[PDB]
Design a protein around this ligand. Structure first.
Ligand SMILES: [Ca+2]
Ligand SMILES: [Ca+2]
Ligand SMILES: [Ca+2]
Length: 404
């Protein structure tokens, strides 16, 4: 069994009294729901309030979310309930604190006394012309416009980040990683970090654009989009590695499928369209996150049908990741907690067998491990396909579950 939970949103840093201290009070609810891992925001000092433009990686106390004591305390309370902690690891880029003879901010400070992480421009991918001095290696991945991209091919970088990472685990208590902007560097570079710190897991945000049409909807076939995510996992180490990836394929598809087009939820081979259908054990599914959802809403889920969203991911193969806002702010707490119960109640896991039974434009029915059957759509009747011995269980707007 394994169920992740994103424990923040784009507005969390603003929490009065501190976000970690407020989370302290949500530990029981979260654990009693069935959650197994909680994803927490970048804990370090950041030029940006949300934590995504890290500067002094060791300076945990400069964090808008809370200091080391409140964080360690939040983590400990999580461990007390058997719930693991996942840190949002942001290393594709980093900001410099001091300028150099050129007047360019490119001399970094780790946040300690000694020289750790006190890099200079030699540590910036040379093709990031804006900050480098041209001595470094070429960026192994995509660039981040607003900050210096770190040259992960440099020996001291790899050794010093691996050090920082291990420290997060030992001193703070973090169990696993969430690799921010993983398309920012090579899967071979992520492998170095994942292998060098051996985390319970490491889900990477590898987010590329989906193939769309003239009208602006995703195409039915999303194999190239999911093949890229699968290839990342393969290059990262495949099954031998703790690496995994967010199912943006499923997120993208589902986002349009619940719009009266549930025929999208099944591919030609009859398997699940997203990464779920080809490598569920490596797929972390989700409805929304701090980017897609929240106050950033770059790709929000049809507001009006979020539960079908959870109906889907909470009952299907692949690793479900519940979003803080939906579990506390929207009011699906009980509905969602139930679905998880049903999931656990049957031992349904990432690799569970999926047998779809209906892909009508307005109705999707599928049987998982033959023990559970779910349904999302405006169609009021599909009993015709519900096997024998199943009794209506959880249910709500445009969705219903069955068990036998
Ligand atoms: Ca220093
Ligand atoms: Ca950059
Ligand atoms: Ca990069």
């Amino acid at each position: 069994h394994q169920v992740l939970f994103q424990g923040f949103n784009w507005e969390s840093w603003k929490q009065s009294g501190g976000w970690y201290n407020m989370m302290m009070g949500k530990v029981d609810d979260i654990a009693a729901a069935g959650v197994t891992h909680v994803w927490l925001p970048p804990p370090s000092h950041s030029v940006s309030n949300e934590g995504y433009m890290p500067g002094r990686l060791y300076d945990i106390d400069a964090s808008k979310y809370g200091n080391a004591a409140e964080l360690k305390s939040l983590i400990g309370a999580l461990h007390g309930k058997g719930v693991q902690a996942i840190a949002d690891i942001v290393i594709n880029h980093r900001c410099a604190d001091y300028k150099d003879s050129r007047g360019i901010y490119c001399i970094f400070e780790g946040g300690t006394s000694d020289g750790r992480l006190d890099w200079g421009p030699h540590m910036i991918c040379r093709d990031d012309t804006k900050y480098s001095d041209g001595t470094a290696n070429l960026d192994t991945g995509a660039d981040f416009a607003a900050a210096p991209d770190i040259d992960h091919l440099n020996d001291r970088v790899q050794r010093e980040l691996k050090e920082w990472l291990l420290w997060l685990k030992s001193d703070l208590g973090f169990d696993a990683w969430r690799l921010d902007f993983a398309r920012g560097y090579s899967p071979e570079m992520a492998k170095v970090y994942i292998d060098g710190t051996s985390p319970s897991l490491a889900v990477a945000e590898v987010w590329d654009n989906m193939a769309t049409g003239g009208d602006g909807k995703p195409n039915y076939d999303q194999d190239a989009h999911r093949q890229n995510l699968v290839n990342w996992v393969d290059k990262v180490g495949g099954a031998a590695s703790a690496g995994m990836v967010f199912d943006f394929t499923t997120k993208g598809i589902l986002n349009a499928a619940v719009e009266g087009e549930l025929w999208r939820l099944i591919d030609p081979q009859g398997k699940a369209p997203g990464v779920m259908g080809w490598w569920p054990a490596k797929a972390v599914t989700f409805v929304d996150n701090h980017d897609t959802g929240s106050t950033q809403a770059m790709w929000p889920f049809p507001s009006d049908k979020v539960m079908q969203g959870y109906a889907y991911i909470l009952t299907h193969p692949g690793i479900p990741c519940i979003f803080y806002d939906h579990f506390f702010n929207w009011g699906f707490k009980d509905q969602i907690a139930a679905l998880v119960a049903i999931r656990k109640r049957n031992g349904i896991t990432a690799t569970s067998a999926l047998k779809i039974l209906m892909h009508e434009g307005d109705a999707y029915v599928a049987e998982i491990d033959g023990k559970v059957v779910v349904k999302i759509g405006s169609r009021a009747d599909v009993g015709a396909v519900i096997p024998a011995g199943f009794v209506t269980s959880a249910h709500g707007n445009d969705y219903a579950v069955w068990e036998k």
